[PDB]
Amino acid sequence: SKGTSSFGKKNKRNHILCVRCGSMSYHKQKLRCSSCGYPEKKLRNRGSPKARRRRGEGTGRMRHLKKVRRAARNGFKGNAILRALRNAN
Amino acid sequence: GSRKTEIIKTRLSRALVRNRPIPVWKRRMRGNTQQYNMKRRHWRRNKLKIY
Amino acid sequence: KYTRKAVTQPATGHPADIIRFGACNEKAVRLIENNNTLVFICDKYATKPQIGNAVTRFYKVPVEKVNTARSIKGYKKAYVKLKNEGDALKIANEAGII
Amino acid sequence: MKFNKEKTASRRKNRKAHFTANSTERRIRMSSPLSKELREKYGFRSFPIRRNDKVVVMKGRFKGNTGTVVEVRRKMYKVYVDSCEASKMNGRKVRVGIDASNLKIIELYQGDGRDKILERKMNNRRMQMERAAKIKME
Amino acid sequence: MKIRTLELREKSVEELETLAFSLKEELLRLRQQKNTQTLKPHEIRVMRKNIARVLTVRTEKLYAEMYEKHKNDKRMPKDLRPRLTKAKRMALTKRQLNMSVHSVCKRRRAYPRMYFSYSE
RNA sequence: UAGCACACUCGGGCGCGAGCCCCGAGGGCCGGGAGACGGGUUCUUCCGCCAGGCCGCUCCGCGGAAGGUGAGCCGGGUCCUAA
RNA sequence: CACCCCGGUGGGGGAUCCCUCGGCCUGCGCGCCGGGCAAGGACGCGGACGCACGCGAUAGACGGCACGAUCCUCAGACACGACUGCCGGUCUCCGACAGCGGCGCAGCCGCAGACAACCCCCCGGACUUAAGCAUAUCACUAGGGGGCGGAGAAGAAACCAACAGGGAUUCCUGCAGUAGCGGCGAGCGAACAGGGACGAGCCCGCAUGGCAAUCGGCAUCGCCGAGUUGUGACAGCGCACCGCGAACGCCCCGGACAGGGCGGCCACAGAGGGCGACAGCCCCGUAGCAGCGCGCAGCGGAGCGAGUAGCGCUGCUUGGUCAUGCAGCGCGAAGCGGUGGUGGCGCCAUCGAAGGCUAAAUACGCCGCAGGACCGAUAGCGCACAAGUACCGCGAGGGGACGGCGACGA
Ligand SMILES: [Mg+2]
Ligand SMILES: [Mg+2]
Ligand SMILES: [Mg+2]
Ligand SMILES: [Mg+2]
Ligand SMILES: [Mg+2]
Ligand SMILES: [Mg+2]
Ligand SMILES: [Mg+2]
Ligand SMILES: [Mg+2]
Ligand SMILES: [Mg+2]
Ligand SMILES: [Mg+2]
Ligand SMILES: [Mg+2]
Ligand SMILES: [Mg+2]
Ligand SMILES: [Mg+2]
Ligand SMILES: [Mg+2]
Ligand SMILES: [Mg+2]
Ligand SMILES: [Mg+2]
Ligand SMILES: [Mg+2]
Ligand SMILES: [Mg+2]
Ligand SMILES: [Mg+2]
Ligand SMILES: [Mg+2]
Ligand SMILES: [Mg+2]
Ligand SMILES: [Mg+2]
Ligand SMILES: [Mg+2]
Ligand SMILES: [Mg+2]
Ligand SMILES: [Mg+2]
Ligand SMILES: [Mg+2]
Ligand SMILES: [Mg+2]
Ligand SMILES: [Mg+2]
Ligand SMILES: [Mg+2]
Ligand SMILES: [Mg+2]
Ligand SMILES: [Mg+2]
Ligand SMILES: [Mg+2]
Ligand SMILES: [Mg+2]
Ligand SMILES: [Zn+2]
Numbered sequence: 001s002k003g004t005s006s007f008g009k010k011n012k013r014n015h016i017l018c019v020r021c022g023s024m025s026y027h028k029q030k031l032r033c034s035s036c037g038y039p040e041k042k043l044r045n046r047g048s049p050k051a052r053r054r055r056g057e058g059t060g061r062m063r064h065l066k067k068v069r070r071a072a073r074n075g076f077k078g079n080a081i082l083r084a085l086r087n088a089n
Numbered sequence: 090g091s092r093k094t095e096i097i098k099t100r101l102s103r104a105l106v107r108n109r110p111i112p113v114w115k116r117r118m119r120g121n122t123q124q125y126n127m128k129r130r131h132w133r134r135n136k137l138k139i140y
Numbered sequence: 141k142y143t144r145k146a147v148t149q150p151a152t153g154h155p156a157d158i159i160r161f162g163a164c165n166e167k168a169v170r171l172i173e174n175n176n177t178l179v180f181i182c183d184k185y186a187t188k189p190q191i192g193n194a195v196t197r198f199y200k201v202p203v204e205k206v207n208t209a210r211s212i213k214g215y216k217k218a219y220v221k222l223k224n225e226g227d228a229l230k231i232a233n234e235a236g237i238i
Numbered sequence: 239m240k241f242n243k244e245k246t247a248s249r250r251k252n253r254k255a256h257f258t259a260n261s262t263e264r265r266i267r268m269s270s271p272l273s274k275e276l277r278e279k280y281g282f283r284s285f286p287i288r289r290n291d292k293v294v295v296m297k298g299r300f301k302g303n304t305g306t307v308v309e310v311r312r313k314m315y316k317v318y319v320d321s322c323e324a325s326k327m328n329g330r331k332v333r334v335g336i337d338a339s340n341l342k343i344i345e346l347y348q349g350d351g352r353d354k355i356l357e358r359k360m361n362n363r364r365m366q367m368e369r370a371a372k373i374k375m376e
Numbered sequence: 377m378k379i380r381t382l383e384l385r386e387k388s389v390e391e392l393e394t395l396a397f398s399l400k401e402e403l404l405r406l407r408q409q410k411n412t413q414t415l416k417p418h419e420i421r422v423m424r425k426n427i428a429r430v431l432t433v434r435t436e437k438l439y440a441e442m443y444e445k446h447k448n449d450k451r452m453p454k455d456l457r458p459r460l461t462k463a464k465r466m467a468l469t470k471r472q473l474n475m476s477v478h479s480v481c482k483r484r485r486a487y488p489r490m491y492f493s494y495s496e
Numbered sequence: 497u498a499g500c501a502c503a504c505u506c507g508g509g510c511g512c513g514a515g516c517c518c519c520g521a522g523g524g525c526c527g528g529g530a531g532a533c534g535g536g537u538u539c540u541u542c543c544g545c546c547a548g549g550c551c552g553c554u555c556c557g558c559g560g561a562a563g564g565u566g567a568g569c570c571g572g573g574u575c576c577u578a579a
Numbered sequence: 580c581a582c583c584c585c586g587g588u589g590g591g592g593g594a595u596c597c598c599u600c601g602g603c604c605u606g607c608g609c610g611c612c613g614g615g616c617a618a619g620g621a622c623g624c625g626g627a628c629g630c631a632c633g634c635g636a637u638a639g640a641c642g643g644c645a646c647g648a649u650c651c652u653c654a655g656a657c658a659c660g661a662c663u664g665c666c667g668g669u670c671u672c673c674g675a676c677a678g679c680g681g682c683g684c685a686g687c688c689g690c691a692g693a694c695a696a697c698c699c700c701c702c703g704g705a706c707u708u709a710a711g712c713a714u715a716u717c718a719c720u721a722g723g724g725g726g727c728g729g730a731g732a733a734g735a736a737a738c739c740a741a742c743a744g745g746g747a748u749u750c751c752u753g754c755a756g757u758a759g760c761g762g763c764g765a766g767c768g769a770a771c772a773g774g775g776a777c778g779a780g781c782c783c784g785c786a787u788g789g790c791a792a793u794c795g796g797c798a799u800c801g802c803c804g805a806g807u808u809g810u811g812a813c814a815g816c817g818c819a820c821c822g823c824g825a826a827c828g829c830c831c832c833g834g835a836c837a838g839g840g841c842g843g844c845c846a847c848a849g850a851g852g853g854c855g856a857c858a859g860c861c862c863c864g865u866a867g868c869a870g871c872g873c874g875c876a877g878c879g880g881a882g883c884g885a886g887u888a889g890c891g892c893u894g895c896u897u898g899g900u901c902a903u904g905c906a907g908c909g910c911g912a913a914g915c916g917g918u919g920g921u922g923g924c925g926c927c928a929u930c931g932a933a934g935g936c937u938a939a940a941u942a943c944g945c946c947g948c949a950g951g952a953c954c955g956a957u958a959g960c961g962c963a964c965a966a967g968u969a970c971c972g973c974g975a976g977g978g979g980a981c982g983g984c985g986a987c988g989a
Binding site: 239240241242243244245246247248250251252253254255256257258259260261262263264265266267268269270271282283284286288289296297298301309310311312313314315316318322323324325326327332333334335336337338339340341342349350351352355359362363364365367369370 | 599600601607645646647648649650651658660661662663664821822823824825826834835836837848849850851852853854855861862863864865866867868869948949950986987988989
């Protein structure tokens with residue numbers, strides 16, 4: 001009753017895909033992601049010290065940041081076509 | 090379950106195309122230490138969390 | 141108002157972007173011969189008028205109806221029925237679909 | 239001693255630099271000494287080995303053999319010389335991989351712009367010897 | 377590298393737009409032959425890459441053209457300004473940081489920097 | 497060792513191999529067929545197996561290769577509001 | 580016969596030892612996010628491509644420059660540039676709007692979101708210690724909220740002092756476990772000096788009146804706007820920045836010489852790594868070697884700070900004690916005021932609050948670099964491996980295991 005019989009009724013799925021963080025944590029009734037806190041503007045304060053190691057900055061692709069490290073290393077010379085045009089004048 | 094949103098089916102298709110063995114020409118590459126796909130997923134043993 | 145983006149990329153929606161290829165399956169051959177219908181595998185974001193406009197542009201034949209189905213294998217299968225009779229068989233030999 | 243603090247004497251970092259060297263560096267690490275007849279002409283100690291280089295084997299089983307370089311493989315660092323071979327079971331003759339340090343170049347290939355690259359190292363060696371001659375003169 | 381960049385510099389920007397559309401068509405004919413027949417393994421590779429090569433030369437010519445159009449503009453387009461950093465774009469200029477009030481100007485003018493050496 | 501199939505039976509077939517796979521016969525038994533949620537390719541075809549299936553398997557929800565989901569009218573959105 | 584013990588061989592398992600492209604620690608360097616769409620995510624992208632990693636419809640090397648002959652499993656590609664390196668392009672979609680705000684504003688902009696080690700502001704525990712416990716302690720911590728930056732904050736005295744006086748801040752030393760606070764219990768606990776690092780000072784307001792001399796915007800030397808409820812000032816920057824680098828032969832053993840033996844050689848190079856055993860001379864390297872320029876102009880200077888200071892009460896805080904700081908409320912100043920380890924009053928002494936800015940010394944993770952009396956696969960990071968992966972949890976979250984043939988020639 002309390003255990004094995006009651007697990008047959010667990011066919012609802014409350015936490016669905018979050019559109020911000022992509023974890024299966026967006027609640028349907030609550031309309032809030034339990035992981036990242038969407039749709040609050042700021043990110044939810046992560047519930048563990050390891051949660052930054054899993055989900056924080058640097059754990060993803062860092063598509064813009066890897067470009068701006070490379071430009072900062074070279075001195076922010078920017079677009080190579082426009083670099084020669086500013087140098088001629 | 091035959092009624093699904095667009096997001097559910099795209100995630101289900103992405104899980105399906107992923108679920109395949111290593112292509113057999115990869116076993117002849119040098120430095121290929123992989124013999125079978127350890128991330129193979131069977132539908133009855135391993136569940137997907139696509140809700 | 142000055143333009144903020146001076147250098148703009150060319151727009152999408154080219155017919156080669158929409159159509160990946162025409163299928164040579166056992167089903168697709170049966171649709172070419174019996175139903176005057178080509179089967180194209182297309183981009184999954186392509187709508188029915190965009191797919192039909194691509195077939196009229198790239199293969200230069202008028203299109204009666206477009207049926208689409210997003211496959212579970214990842215792509216969008218599009219069934220393109222042509223207007224003129226015997227014409228899908230005329231396309232698939234010239235296009236090399238069969 | 240190495241007085242440059244910015245370069246490593248660390249074994250771990252030197253070993254990682256050898257096995258994860260990129261292809262431009264792996265070409266340099268596969269250098270081979272010249273003969274004395276090449277060193278009177280070119281002057282430099284060694285040069286990176288290339289296909290179609292004539293080579294005498296200096297160490298190993300094939301020591302004393304001469305042959306052309308028929309295959310260089312940068313990953314696994316192995317030079318394959320013509321007439322340094324071993325058969326498989328099915329009679330197929332396989333070239334045996336020799337390290338570039340065990341080969342001495344007898345005749346340098348000069349075809350695909352390599353004569354430019356040899357002369358660039360030769361002239362920079364000659365120019366740098368002129369500067370060190372003037373500095374020791376002064 | 378079937379289409380070389382040397383030939384693409386001669387074409388104009390709209391001439392490269394038609395070339396990328398024509399090359400996209402041939403890629404669709406190549407993807408047809410890959411499904412129906414065999415192909416040399418990198419034919420789709422090569423045609424995909426020279427579409428990218430035509431479009432890059434199109435972009436590189438267009439950055440050069442749009443720069444000389446809006447060079448002496450009051451507000452250049454954001455494409456043609458250097459993308460430093462949002463913080464570095466919002467920085468005060470070196471002229472603005474050197475701005476000082478009149479009393480700091482008169483004092484530096486009336487008591488300028490002296491160049492001297494001491495010895496005992 | 498505890499334990500694990502113990503309403504089936506007979507003949508035939510394919511097969512290296514058969515109590516269980518297939519066919520025919522006999523004897524019995526009970527649900528079966530459509531939707532949702534949930535599953536996600538398990539569907540279907542071809543090939544396989546000396547691995548998995550509380551035994552065995554030539555079989556399979558297994559392994560491999562494929563194939564398959566077509567809508568103005570069905571369901572949802574492009575509609576309406578309920579709490 | 581079984582059973583047991585000892586040994587041999589074979590199993591079984593993975594200890595030991597040796598190894599190590601990993602960790603850890605320390606130092607140094609860097610300190611650069613975002614509507615130009617970030618962090619993160621979703622989905623796609625390879626001829627044969629699952630995972631990993633890379634990438635974005637220009638989707639598994641697109642361009643420029645440098646490099647110069649391989650990449651490879653097949654097929655193929657390749658001096659019309661393979662493999663690479665550096666930089667730049669392209670860079671889907673979700674994710675920063677009921678948006679909010681500035682400027683006369685045909686319009687142009689900004690804020691949001693990330694980062695959470697360092698730093699600033701607010702909020703603020705309890706376990707714990709007191710051998711119980713309530714004040715105290717833990718602790719003005721943890722934690723939560725907000726906000727920056729490459730540092731931040733602070734900062735040119737309403738200061739310290741009591742001397743023959745010193746002279747911004749920050750940091751170190753030191754005062755000092757001291758004065759002091761404290762159920763005067765447990766415990767807590769500074770400051771001036773002296774010495775040092777580093778050094779740096781400035782500004783707004785009450786600016787002309789023979790004329791706002793000032794600024795913003797534009798489609799620009801002319802409009803429009805701001806503004807008299809008052810606008811007004813230039814001393815610092817930049818470029819260049821290499822390619823080469825010495826010196827070894829023979830014999831023995833061995834699968835192989837880097838070993839042994841003999842004989843040399845180079846060294847401003849005998850650091851280290853690779854190479855079929857342990858290499859100064861085989862290779863990569865190592866020691867060694869290379870700079871500069873361009874700027875700085877003018878016109879006010881006694882301006883001064885109020886619902887404050889202070890007092891009273893309250894709450895918090897502090898070592899701060901008849902109040903150290905902070906706040907709220909009541910009262911509410913002055914031309915003189917504040918302060919003087921902090922009761923009141925008087926002296927004398929010393930400063931000028933209630934406006935603003937300010938380098939350097941100081942702190943610090945990721946990351947990069949270099950080191951180390953560190954650990955050496957149950958250790959060291961959770962991860963030397965398709966590790967924040969597999970996997971589990973409705974969820975917040977939780978989180979492993981797994982290294983080794985050889986001359987990669989057979
Ligand atoms: Mg229920
Ligand atoms: Mg519910
Ligand atoms: Mg469902
Ligand atoms: Mg189940
Ligand atoms: Mg594009
Ligand atoms: Mg449909
Ligand atoms: Mg039994
Ligand atoms: Mg039964
Ligand atoms: Mg059914
Ligand atoms: Mg079936
Ligand atoms: Mg079996
Ligand atoms: Mg025994
Ligand atoms: Mg183990
Ligand atoms: Mg560190
Ligand atoms: Mg983007
Ligand atoms: Mg390229
Ligand atoms: Mg913010
Ligand atoms: Mg404790
Ligand atoms: Mg106690
Ligand atoms: Mg106790
Ligand atoms: Mg107690
Ligand atoms: Mg910043
Ligand atoms: Mg500051
Ligand atoms: Mg305390
Ligand atoms: Mg003024
Ligand atoms: Mg040398
Ligand atoms: Mg007050
Ligand atoms: Mg006084
Ligand atoms: Mg006193
Ligand atoms: Mg002041
Ligand atoms: Mg071990
Ligand atoms: Mg471990
Ligand atoms: Mg449970
Ligand atoms: Zn979320």
